[PDB]
């Protein structure tokens, strides 16, 4: 949160290309770097817009952008903490450390399912945007799971329908 | 399966615009109409290609396309059967009739969830392409569920991991 408003408003005006006073997903995406030289995951860019857009306008204003800026800044720090070999991509073992550090207790084999599902380069090494994405979706599905797991034991009983409106809970 | 090879090979060559001898995901999209004046759902088009693509060439050849052609024809027929008020879009009541006719036994309120998830127009009326997608995904997930539901009673017990591992489908 270190920078002043002057800095972050100069940043805002820069990212707000059409000068409409609202940063759109399209504009945020161009501001963001995933390190790989490919456009920042658009699904992730939209996830971040609607987390910080309160007044439903498919965008963020200056005040909400300062939160966007902080949310991105915090994720970057997390990324570099668990990017131990300094490669700019998170691998399976790095992902195991990151998720364990988030308090997740998940088997080895599952981390492969994770990389497969969220790695867009298909190299088995996760870029900054796909790591945010994988994580946003994890925390989303844990919440859903905790809604149902009344004794929080990590096991639930579901009907076929309950089950289906959980996979359509995403 | 009523037209001759001549007919469907003529079709094939029109759709096969770069003439590589393989119909790709892009070229089939331009062949398909959803009725709504928008590009045929590209995910569905992807699903249909890799259902019929056996040589993993991100596309289909002539023989495989004849199957693509039949698969789409069968779907058009199903769509028209349940499109009962003749509007070109499946509504909730029509969707309840279709799914029940497929042998699904689902509650009223679940049909709202299905429409919201797969109606890419956002009017609560489902176009041809989104009805295929809805249905593809439905039967795809019924299969996942039946792998786990040992006594096929319609109830499973899942761990948080099993849950995530099967929800990533
Ligand atoms: Ca703008
Ligand atoms: Ca690394
Ligand atoms: Ca429980
Ligand atoms: Ca071609
Ligand atoms: Ca209708
Ligand atoms: Ca009719
Ligand atoms: Ca059972």
Curated annotation (Swiss-Prot), chain A:
UniProt entry tagged with the keyword Transcription: no
Record's protein name: Programmed cell death protein 6
Molecular function terms, GO-annotated: calcium ion binding; calcium-dependent protein binding; identical protein binding; magnesium ion binding; protein dimerization activity; protein heterodimerization activity; protein homodimerization activity; protein-macromolecule adaptor activity
Domain of life: Eukaryota
Subunit structure: Homodimer and heterodimer; heterodimerizes (via the EF-hand 5) with PEF1. Isoform 1 and isoform 2 self-associate; probably forming homodimers. Interacts with CPNE4 (via VWFA domain). Interacts with PDCD6IP; the interaction is calcium-dependent. Interacts with RBM22. Interacts with PLSCR4. Interacts with ANXA7 and TSG101. Interacts with DAPK1. Interacts with SEC31A; the interaction is calcium-dependent and promotes monoubiquitination of SEC31A. Interacts with ANXA11 (via N-terminus); the interaction is calcium-dependent.
Result when mutating residue 102 to A: Increases interaction with PDCD6IP and ANXA7. Impairs interaction with ANXA11. Augments stauroporine-induced cell death
Gene Ontology, cellular component aspect: COPII vesicle coat; Cul3-RING ubiquitin ligase complex; cytoplasm; cytoplasmic vesicle; cytosol; endoplasmic reticulum; endoplasmic reticulum exit site; endoplasmic reticulum membrane
InterPro entries: EF-hand-dom_pair, EF_Hand_1_Ca_BS, EF_hand_dom, Peflin/Sorcin_CaBP
A Pfam family: EF-hand_7
Domain-related comment: Interacts with different set of proteins thanks to 3 different hydrophobic pockets. Hydrophobic pockets 1 and 2, which mediate interaction with PDCD6IP, are largely formed by residues from EF-hand 3 (EF3) to 5 (EF5), as well as by Tyr-160 (EF5) of a dimerizing molecule (Pocket 1) and from EF-hand (EF2) to 4 (EF4) (Pocket 2). Hydrophobic pocket 3, which mediates interaction with SEC31A, is mainly formed by residues from EF-hand 1 (EF1) to 3 (EF3). EF-hand 1 (EF1) and 3 (EF3) are the high-affinity calcium-binding sites, while EF-hand 5 (EF5) binds calcium with low-affinity. A one-residue insertion in the EF5-binding loop prevents the glutamyl residue at the C-terminal end of the loop from serving as the canonical bidentate calcium ligand. EF5 acts as a high-affinity magnesium-binding domain instead. Magnesium, may affect dimerization. EF5 may bind either calcium or magnesium depending on the context.
Localization in the cell: Endoplasmic reticulum membrane; Cytoplasmic vesicle, COPII-coated vesicle membrane; Cytoplasm; Nucleus
């Amino acid at each position: 949160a270190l920078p002043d408003q002057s800095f972050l408003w100069n940043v805002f005006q820069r990212v707000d290309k059409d000068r409409s006073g609202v940063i759109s997903d399209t504009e945020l995406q161009q501001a963001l770097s995933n390190g790989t030289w490919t456009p920042f995951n658009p699904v992730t860019v939209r996830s971040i817009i609607s987390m910080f857009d309160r007044e439903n306008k498919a965008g963020v204003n200056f005040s909400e952008f300062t939160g966007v800026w902080k949310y991105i800044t915090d994720w970057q720090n997390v990324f570099r903490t668990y990017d131990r070999d300094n490669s700019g991509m998170i691998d399976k073992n790095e992902l195991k450390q990151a998720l364990s550090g988030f308090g997740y207790r998940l088997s080895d084999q599952f981390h492969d399912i994770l990389i497969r599902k969220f790695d867009r380069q298909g190299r088995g090494q996760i870029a900054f945007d796909d790591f945010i994405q994988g994580c946003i979706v994890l925390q989303r599905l844990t919440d859903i799971f905790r809604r149902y797991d009344t004794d929080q034991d990590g096991w639930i009983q579901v009907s076929y329908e309950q089950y289906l409106s959980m996979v359509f809970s995403i």
